[PDB]
Amino acid sequence: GVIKPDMKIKLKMEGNVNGHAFVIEGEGEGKPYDGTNTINLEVKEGAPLPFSYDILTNAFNRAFTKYPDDIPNYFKQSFPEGYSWERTMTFEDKGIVKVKSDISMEEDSFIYEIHLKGENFPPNGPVMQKKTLKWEPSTEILYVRDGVLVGDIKHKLLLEGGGHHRVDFKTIYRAKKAVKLPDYHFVDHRIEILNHDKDYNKVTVYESAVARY
């Protein structure tokens, strides 16, 4: 098929959080039909990052989602043309991140061009203090809104010490062609930073995603 069972991943993120600019490049691979993906990432500019790396991970492609045949696959159907997405992550304490990503395909690889802007994070909040542990497993609710697909997530960051910090996600996914639109459904996610060096200049991220009724 146009989307192979094993696809490479190449991306670039230009970001700025609390005024701090930085660039991260990534190369990885995933199994689109199994809903898994792994990406090795390096900070090319702006190191060492002065904020929690977890706020970036979800930015590092729903084509990597396991779907049942009975739920139209908004993402996979969009190819080879591709799709783009825009997201707003609203944090418990006023911090906010806005991200946009363009996903295209080149042979057996997906290429992403990402732009991220984070602002208003409290100086003595877990993001700036780098006190986050990981994202808890999540469930994204997907449904059609104005001809495109919307995903909502009532998310939570697990903090060092055991506490949690809420983060509300709203993502709008836009296919670059007409595709069969799905009825509301859910996607269970589990994202993890598999390994990282001291200041997260070198990180490997992994995510699993499964669609369900």
CSV table of C-alpha atoms in Angstrom, one decimal:
chain,number,residue,atom,x,y,z
A,1,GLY,CA,0.0,0.0,0.0
A,2,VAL,CA,1.0,3.6,-0.1
A,3,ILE,CA,1.7,3.5,3.6
A,4,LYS,CA,4.2,0.7,4.3
A,5,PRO,CA,4.1,-1.4,7.5
A,6,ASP,CA,7.4,0.2,8.5
A,7,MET,CA,7.8,3.9,7.9
A,8,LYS,CA,10.8,6.2,8.7
A,9,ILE,CA,10.3,9.5,10.4
A,10,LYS,CA,12.2,12.7,9.9
A,11,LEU,CA,11.3,16.0,11.5
A,12,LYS,CA,12.4,19.5,12.5
A,13,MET,CA,11.0,21.6,15.3
A,14,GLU,CA,11.6,25.4,15.6
A,15,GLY,CA,10.4,26.3,19.0
A,16,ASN,CA,10.4,29.1,21.6
A,17,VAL,CA,9.3,28.7,25.2
A,18,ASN,CA,9.2,31.6,27.6
A,19,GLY,CA,11.3,33.5,25.2
A,20,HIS,CA,14.0,30.8,24.8
A,21,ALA,CA,14.5,29.9,21.2
A,22,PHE,CA,15.7,26.4,20.1
A,23,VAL,CA,15.8,23.9,17.3
A,24,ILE,CA,15.4,20.1,17.6
A,25,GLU,CA,15.9,17.6,14.8
A,26,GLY,CA,14.6,14.1,14.8
A,27,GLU,CA,14.9,10.8,12.9
A,28,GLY,CA,12.8,7.6,13.8
A,29,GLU,CA,10.6,4.8,12.6
A,30,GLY,CA,7.3,3.3,13.4
A,31,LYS,CA,4.6,0.7,12.5
A,32,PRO,CA,1.6,2.7,11.3
A,33,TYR,CA,-0.8,-0.3,11.5
A,34,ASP,CA,0.4,-1.3,14.9
A,35,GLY,CA,0.1,2.2,16.2
A,36,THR,CA,3.7,2.6,17.5
A,37,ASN,CA,6.5,5.0,16.8
A,38,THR,CA,10.0,5.9,18.1
A,39,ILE,CA,12.0,9.0,17.4
A,40,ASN,CA,15.6,9.9,18.3
A,41,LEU,CA,15.9,13.6,18.9
A,42,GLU,CA,18.7,16.1,19.2
A,43,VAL,CA,18.7,19.7,20.2
A,44,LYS,CA,20.5,21.6,17.5
A,45,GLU,CA,20.2,25.1,18.9
A,46,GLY,CA,19.2,26.5,22.3
A,47,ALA,CA,20.9,23.8,24.5
A,48,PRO,CA,20.6,23.2,27.2
A,49,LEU,CA,16.8,23.7,27.2
A,50,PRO,CA,15.7,25.5,30.4
A,51,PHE,CA,12.3,23.8,30.7
A,52,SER,CA,10.6,20.4,31.0
A,53,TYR,CA,11.2,18.2,27.9
A,54,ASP,CA,7.8,16.6,28.4
A,55,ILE,CA,6.0,19.7,27.1
A,56,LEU,CA,7.5,18.9,23.7
A,57,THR,CA,7.0,15.1,23.3
A,58,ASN,CA,3.5,15.0,21.9
A,59,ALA,CA,4.6,17.4,19.2
A,60,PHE,CA,7.1,14.7,18.1
A,61,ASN,CA,1.5,11.9,13.8
A,62,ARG,CA,-1.7,10.0,14.1
A,63,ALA,CA,-0.9,8.0,11.0
A,64,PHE,CA,0.8,6.0,13.6
A,65,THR,CA,-2.4,4.7,15.2
A,66,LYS,CA,-3.9,1.2,15.3
A,67,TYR,CA,-7.5,1.5,13.9
A,68,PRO,CA,-10.3,-1.0,13.4
A,69,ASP,CA,-11.6,-1.3,9.9
A,70,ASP,CA,-15.0,-0.1,10.8
A,71,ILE,CA,-13.8,3.4,11.8
A,72,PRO,CA,-12.7,5.5,8.9
A,73,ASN,CA,-9.1,6.4,9.3
A,74,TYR,CA,-8.9,10.1,8.8
A,75,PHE,CA,-5.2,10.1,9.0
A,76,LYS,CA,-4.2,7.2,6.8
A,77,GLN,CA,-6.7,8.1,4.1
A,78,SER,CA,-5.1,11.5,3.8
A,79,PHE,CA,-2.0,10.1,2.1
A,80,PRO,CA,0.0,10.5,0.1
A,81,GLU,CA,-1.2,14.1,0.1
A,82,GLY,CA,-0.8,14.3,3.9
A,83,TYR,CA,-2.3,16.5,6.5
A,84,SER,CA,-1.5,19.3,8.9
A,85,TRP,CA,-2.5,19.9,12.5
A,86,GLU,CA,-2.7,22.8,15.0
A,87,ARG,CA,-2.8,22.3,18.7
A,88,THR,CA,-3.3,24.3,21.9
A,89,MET,CA,-2.2,22.8,25.2
A,90,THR,CA,-3.6,24.8,28.2
A,91,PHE,CA,-1.8,24.3,31.4
A,92,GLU,CA,-3.2,24.2,35.0
A,93,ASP,CA,-1.2,27.4,35.9
A,94,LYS,CA,-1.5,29.7,32.9
A,95,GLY,CA,1.3,28.4,30.8
A,96,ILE,CA,0.3,27.8,27.2
A,97,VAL,CA,1.8,26.0,24.2
A,98,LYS,CA,0.6,26.4,20.7
A,99,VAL,CA,2.0,24.0,18.1
A,100,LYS,CA,1.5,23.5,14.4
A,101,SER,CA,2.8,20.6,12.3
A,102,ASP,CA,2.8,19.7,8.6
A,103,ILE,CA,3.0,16.0,7.8
A,104,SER,CA,4.0,14.9,4.3
A,105,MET,CA,5.4,11.7,2.8
A,106,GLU,CA,8.5,11.0,0.7
A,107,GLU,CA,8.8,7.4,-0.3
A,108,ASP,CA,8.7,5.3,2.9
A,109,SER,CA,9.1,8.2,5.2
A,110,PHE,CA,6.8,10.7,6.9
A,111,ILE,CA,8.4,14.2,7.2
A,112,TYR,CA,7.2,16.8,9.8
A,113,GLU,CA,7.8,20.5,9.9
A,114,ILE,CA,6.9,21.6,13.4
A,115,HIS,CA,6.6,25.1,15.0
A,116,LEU,CA,6.0,25.4,18.7
A,117,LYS,CA,5.5,28.5,20.9
A,118,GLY,CA,5.2,28.2,24.7
A,119,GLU,CA,4.5,31.2,27.0
A,120,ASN,CA,3.6,32.4,30.4
A,121,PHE,CA,5.0,29.5,32.3
A,122,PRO,CA,5.4,30.4,36.0
A,123,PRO,CA,9.1,30.7,37.0
A,124,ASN,CA,8.5,28.5,40.0
A,125,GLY,CA,6.1,26.0,38.3
A,126,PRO,CA,7.0,22.4,37.4
A,127,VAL,CA,7.6,23.2,33.8
A,128,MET,CA,10.3,25.8,34.3
A,129,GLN,CA,11.6,23.9,37.4
A,130,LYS,CA,11.9,20.8,35.3
A,131,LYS,CA,9.9,18.8,37.9
A,132,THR,CA,7.8,16.7,35.5
A,133,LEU,CA,8.2,12.9,35.4
A,134,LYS,CA,6.1,11.9,32.4
A,135,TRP,CA,2.7,12.2,30.7
A,136,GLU,CA,0.2,9.8,32.3
A,137,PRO,CA,-1.5,7.5,29.8
A,138,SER,CA,-4.3,9.4,28.0
A,139,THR,CA,-7.5,9.1,25.9
A,140,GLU,CA,-8.0,11.5,23.1
A,141,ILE,CA,-11.6,12.1,22.0
A,142,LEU,CA,-11.9,12.5,18.3
A,143,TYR,CA,-14.9,13.9,16.4
A,144,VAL,CA,-15.7,16.0,13.3
A,145,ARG,CA,-16.1,19.8,13.6
A,146,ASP,CA,-16.6,22.0,10.5
A,147,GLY,CA,-15.5,19.4,8.0
A,148,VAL,CA,-12.2,18.6,9.8
A,149,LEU,CA,-11.2,16.4,12.7
A,150,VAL,CA,-10.9,17.6,16.3
A,151,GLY,CA,-9.2,15.8,19.2
A,152,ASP,CA,-9.7,16.7,22.8
A,153,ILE,CA,-7.6,15.5,25.8
A,154,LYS,CA,-8.0,16.1,29.5
A,155,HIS,CA,-4.4,15.3,30.1
A,156,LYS,CA,-2.1,15.2,33.2
A,157,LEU,CA,1.6,15.4,33.8
A,158,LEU,CA,2.9,13.2,36.6
A,159,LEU,CA,5.3,15.2,38.7
A,160,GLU,CA,8.4,14.3,40.7
A,161,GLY,CA,7.0,13.5,44.1
A,162,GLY,CA,3.7,11.9,42.9
A,163,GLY,CA,1.5,14.9,42.1
A,164,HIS,CA,-0.2,15.8,38.8
A,165,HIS,CA,-0.6,19.0,36.7
A,166,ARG,CA,-3.5,19.3,34.4
A,167,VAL,CA,-3.0,20.1,30.7
A,168,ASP,CA,-6.0,20.4,28.3
A,169,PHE,CA,-5.2,19.6,24.7
A,170,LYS,CA,-7.3,20.7,21.7
A,171,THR,CA,-6.0,19.6,18.3
A,172,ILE,CA,-7.5,20.3,14.9
A,173,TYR,CA,-6.4,17.8,12.2
A,174,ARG,CA,-6.8,18.9,8.5
A,175,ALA,CA,-6.5,16.3,5.7
A,176,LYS,CA,-5.2,17.7,2.4
A,177,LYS,CA,-7.9,15.9,0.4
A,178,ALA,CA,-11.5,14.8,0.8
A,179,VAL,CA,-11.6,11.6,2.9
A,180,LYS,CA,-14.4,9.5,4.6
A,181,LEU,CA,-15.2,11.2,7.9
A,182,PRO,CA,-15.5,9.1,11.0
A,183,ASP,CA,-18.1,9.2,13.8
A,184,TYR,CA,-16.8,10.1,17.2
A,185,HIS,CA,-14.3,7.6,18.7
A,186,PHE,CA,-11.3,7.4,21.0
A,187,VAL,CA,-7.6,7.0,20.9
A,188,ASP,CA,-5.7,5.6,23.9
A,189,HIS,CA,-2.1,7.0,24.0
A,190,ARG,CA,0.9,6.0,26.1
A,191,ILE,CA,4.0,8.3,25.4
A,192,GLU,CA,7.3,7.9,27.1
A,193,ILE,CA,10.8,9.4,27.0
A,194,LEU,CA,12.6,6.0,26.7
A,195,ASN,CA,16.0,7.5,27.6
A,196,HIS,CA,17.8,10.9,27.6
A,197,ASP,CA,21.1,12.4,28.5
A,198,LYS,CA,21.6,14.8,31.4
A,199,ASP,CA,20.2,18.0,29.9
A,200,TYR,CA,18.0,16.2,27.3
A,201,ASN,CA,20.2,17.2,24.4
A,202,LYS,CA,19.8,13.7,23.2
A,203,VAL,CA,16.4,12.0,23.7
A,204,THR,CA,14.5,9.0,22.4
A,205,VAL,CA,10.7,9.2,22.5
A,206,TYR,CA,8.2,6.3,22.0
A,207,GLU,CA,4.4,6.4,21.7
A,208,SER,CA,1.7,3.8,21.3
A,209,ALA,CA,-1.7,4.7,20.1
A,210,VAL,CA,-4.9,2.6,19.6
A,211,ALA,CA,-8.3,3.6,18.3
A,212,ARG,CA,-11.4,2.3,20.0
A,213,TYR,CA,-15.2,2.7,19.9
